[PDB]
Amino acid sequence: MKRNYILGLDIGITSVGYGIIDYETRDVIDAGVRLFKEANVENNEGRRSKRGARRLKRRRRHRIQRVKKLLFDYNLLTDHSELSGINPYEARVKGLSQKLSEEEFSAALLHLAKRRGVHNVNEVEEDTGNELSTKEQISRNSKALEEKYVAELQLERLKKDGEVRGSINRFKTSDYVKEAKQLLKVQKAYHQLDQSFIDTYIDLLETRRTYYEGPGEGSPFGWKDIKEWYEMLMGHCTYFPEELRSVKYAYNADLYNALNDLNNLVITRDENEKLEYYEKFQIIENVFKQKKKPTLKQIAKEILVNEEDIKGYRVTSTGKPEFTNLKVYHDIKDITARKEIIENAELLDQIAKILTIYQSSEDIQEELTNLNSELTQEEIEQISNLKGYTGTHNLSLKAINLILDELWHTNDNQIAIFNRLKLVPKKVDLSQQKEIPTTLVDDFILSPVVKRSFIQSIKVINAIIKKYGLPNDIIIELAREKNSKDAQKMINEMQKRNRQTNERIEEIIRTTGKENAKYLIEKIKLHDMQEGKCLYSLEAIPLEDLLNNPFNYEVDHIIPRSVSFDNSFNNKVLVKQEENSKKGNRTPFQYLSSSDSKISYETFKKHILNLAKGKGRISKTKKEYLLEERDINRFSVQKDFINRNLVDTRYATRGLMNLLRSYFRVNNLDVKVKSINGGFTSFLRRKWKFKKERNKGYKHHAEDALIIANADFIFKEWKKLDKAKKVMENEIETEQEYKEIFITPHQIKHIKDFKDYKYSHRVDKKPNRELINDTLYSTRKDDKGNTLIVNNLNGLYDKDNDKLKKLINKSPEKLLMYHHDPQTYQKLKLIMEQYGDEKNPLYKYYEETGNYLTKYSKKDNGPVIKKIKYYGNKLNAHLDITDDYPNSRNKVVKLSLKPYRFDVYLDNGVYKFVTVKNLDVIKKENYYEVNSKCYEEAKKLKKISNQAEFIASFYNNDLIKINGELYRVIGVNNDLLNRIEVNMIDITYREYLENMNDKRPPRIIKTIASKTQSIKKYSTDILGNLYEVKSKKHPQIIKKG
Amino acid sequence: DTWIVYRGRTADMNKSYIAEGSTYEEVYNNFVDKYGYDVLDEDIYEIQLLKKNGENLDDYDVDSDGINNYDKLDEFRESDYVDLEDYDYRELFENSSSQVYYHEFEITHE
RNA sequence: UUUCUAUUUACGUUUUAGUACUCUGGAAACAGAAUCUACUAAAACAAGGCAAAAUGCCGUGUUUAUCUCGUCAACGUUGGCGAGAU
């Protein structure tokens, strides 16, 4: 119904937790968490790389087919002719002279066509695992091909080295074209050829689709012409719809980023701390046009002030000050320095766009040539070889100019410019839409994990709005981890840091001889960081007195928590009780200025600066907090502290906040949405003592969310921070007041006691997900009549691979060699026995004899042996593709048929199920339909009668209820044995085992074949309500897809 | 301290699977979480455990699907098995060719 | 903040065919046998679905409770629409 409530979100990487809090009574209407499999860039890299292959294979087959059709036209190739025996390499060399028979000629042309070779030498996109780069390989081949054509080099390699294929046969298309025309000029004198045929064949040989032409007609991933190419590569700007987004390395956008940094810088001087228009122009010109990489010292020298007074700039990971440089402008000045080029913003922009979109240098030089500029021909050739310009989607140029104008005139930053101008996304009209539209999340450039999390969170918001009405306030937390590969790296690093601190504590314990260190960890961490020096009075502090008299020292906060909002060790220090009492709720600047301190401010600053550099014991923010000369009473300074410590600033959170604010503003809904920093929720978890454990399952992602919502209620019951809310949703107090405001654990036990934490998982009905694992294992037939898969041993000569050894000693009869070729087994065995001590006897044999294990021969002319094949295991499930490979004496199979869904039937009182495998979902146009014949065959294979009643059909993650215990299906394990796989709904089983320290295997596998009293289907909405689902009486055949 | 990164390419060298962790055991645990449990050959962890304890694989009906006699496997699990030694999770990854045909492990010490 | 696409090369897993290998009959021409180990050509490379001599085109990613009402669309079931319920 209509109930005022605060909504809180915990937007993780693999979950989105939601919580509802009563506006009045701190109550909890409903909590929960939506789940989803972690999005990964890899999968999409999968579909794309494969698509890229299918296309290469299709183009190769089409070129072969077109050449074959062309040669039918001239009667050179006919169906009766046999091309089986002709050798391609020997025919190309002969035909470079003499004459070729009609067959040999056909073989040779078809042969060059199958392999044209690369065209743009650097165009290749591949790793250097082959140990020879593509460009170096072509360079060596060209150095070898001065007087010899391609065929000659390949034939010479086959006769001398014995091989042609491999990584040595990477060539360039020009040599192939030269060979083709050279052979054709000779062979046209004997056969009926015309210049039209010659041109057609050469075209077919060197033809290729440029990166700006795309696929042909009718493709969903294509474009009609090059204007549409710009539109697709750039996209329409969300801020101004009709204008297209510009490139990022372009000069105007470089100026915008650089001006952001310049505006952010704070310089302690008699003038304003923020630089004004004229000196901003002076600094930008001098620094960013005379020096390639700007540094802070250069700025300090040009404004002739102390570098010590400059604060508030981005820093690299290594601590070096970072300033974004006009890379394109300096790159221009490197080659040419004329005035006519460097002071033309439009020319520099167009140059940048061309370099960024046009990968090939030949296209770049042509496009600058078509641009009627002052560039000269000699300069264009040099400029065309510029690199590193690789950013495609960036704020539109028309908006960039508007932001740059405001930046030049005023000292503001981008966020407040956006708020002032009230720039609103216009790609989708927010007025007409009934609910928040998930389309807008596509445009902001966010990693796929964050995109999926945002879409799920928006759907959760839509569901909650539809259920409990309009939310008075929404609080959104995006979690710190970008992706899982970072959650582990961070957890590992934190574990290592925890271990080093534990080691310091243990070393102290032995020397001290007391257990006081057990509760003194916070102070002892501070002591060595301050090197036993009271930062407020410089007096030396012995480490022993800290343990003996812990009350003589206290953990004071550098900045009052009423404004700093920071509770990290960076904002903590060990000080004399008298020092802390005298300091009060103020800043160290005015206190060291005051006579209370027994040291002067300048000496304090000198000690702090030298200490910060030495031993890396003072963090970057710690010295800024210590040396914060600006008065905290100023509204701008309190706002700055709130933003750096309480308001998230990462692009992702901002974009989501801006989208939600725009949606609520357009529809005129009085909904305040606000963000919370990642460390703030950790602190509020610590001070309310809710951190008992992190393995209670997924309910953790819910509980944190609840706390997030509670933050709102503690930002409106107290007027002292109320203004701060107005800052964060768009007096000065001591630390005990801060503790009174936040520590108070009243009505927070509700989070401890709430047990009805609804959970939900994302069903994955998508068809065509994957079909068969790809490794076309061959098979053989053994004596007992079975069929065995023949896995192949590879990399035998490598130092660490000992498989051959283990197999030889344990089971020789498994190597195919044992029976089909015995002598060679004898040679391998004699080698294994003599050098058996080494992990890899073959490597040790190579290290002393320098010969690979050759096949046994009477003349010792045998070939090398690099792959030995062996019988492996028996065959149970297989997609037999033997029909594709013609006349195959032995079967060819693929394994691991990935199941799509399974349907449960109740026949004669017993429950069975038929597995609709993904291979049985054929695709016709838009609809995806279950192959009726294969489905019927599978149904009959399970011994299912025709009157069997239909109960349900389960996809992935649909909730099942077997004998009364709810579970979520992951997929059927083995269909023949009637085994399905379920992981518990609340906590992943792997965790359920650790909270009991059991060692049972990690995947619950349950059996539906018999003794299964009930198999019902339960389903859960995005929020998480559990509603038993009564399904239809015929299994679904057509999914719209 | 050591970081081991598993780069596994599918047979065509086209689709690439990559996981990383502190001890090889961590590599297997991440690869079965991030890229699913059937990317490696079916039932490889069990097959290696049975082989290390010393049981005859044929009795349990080893198949491409792997242990097919679940009843007996459960009995072996009941007996105190001898656990894997974190030097054989490498073997678990290099004896699977169903999808990850080419497996190359890089070990960084720092 | 770094996603989404685009073109291309070499490889690579597999079968068949050929040339080497191994073996037997055997003076062997060769006949075979074995299909093991190397090359070499051609073919297939997620099941398949369109299209129709085209510098041809889709198929492993995003979006997903279920049931329902009606509305509309594809085509009876799916949509999509909306409005509910569970």
Residue numbers in the entry:
A (entry chain A): 1 to 730, 743 to 1053
B (entry chain C): 61 to 170
Structure paper excerpt:
AcrIIA15 is an anti-CRISPR (Acr) protein that inhibits Staphylococcus aureus Cas9 (SaCas9). The AcrIIA15 protein, consisting of 170 amino acids, is comprised of two domains: an N-terminal domain (NTD) from residues 1 to 56, which contains a HTH motif resembling a transcriptional repressor, and a C-terminal domain (CTD) from residues 57 to 170. AcrIIA15, by combining the HTH domain and Cas9 inhibitory domain within a single protein, exhibits dual functionality as a bi-functional anti-CRISPR protein capable of both transcriptional repression and CRISPR-based cleavage inhibition. Our structural and biochemical studies demonstrate that AcrIIA15 functions as a dimer to simultaneously inhibit both anti-CRISPR operon transcription and SaCas9-sgRNA DNA recognition.
To elucidate the molecular mechanisms underlying AcrIIA15 inhibition, we solved the cryo-EM structure of SaCas9-sgRNA-AcrIIA15CTD ternary complex at a resolution of 3.31 Å. In the ternary complex, one AcrIIA15CTD molecule binds to one SaCas9-sgRNA complex. AcrIIA15CTD is situated in the cleft between the PAM interacting (PI) and wedge (WED) domains of SaCas9. Notably, the PAM region of the target DNA would also be located within this same cleft between the PI and WED domains of SaCas9. AcrIIA15CTD is composed of five α-helices and a β-sheet consisting of three β-strands. The surface of AcrIIA15CTD carries a significant negative charge and resembles the size and shape of conventional B-form dsDNA. Specifically, the PAM recognition residues of SaCas9, N985 and N986, form hydrogen bonds with AcrIIA15 residues Y130 and D125, respectively, showing that AcrIIA15CTD binding directly blocks the PAM recognition sites in SaCas9. Specifically, the sidechain of D72 in AcrIIA15 forms hydrogen bonds with residue K50 of SaCas9, as well as with the base of G21, which is the first nucleotide of the repeat region in the sgRNA. Notably, mutations of AcrIIA15 residues Y161 and Y162, interacting with the sgRNA and the WED domain, completely abolished AcrIIA15CTD′s inhibitory activity. Taken together, our findings show that AcrIIA15CTD inhibits the DNA cleavage activity of SaCas9 by preventing it from binding to target DNA.
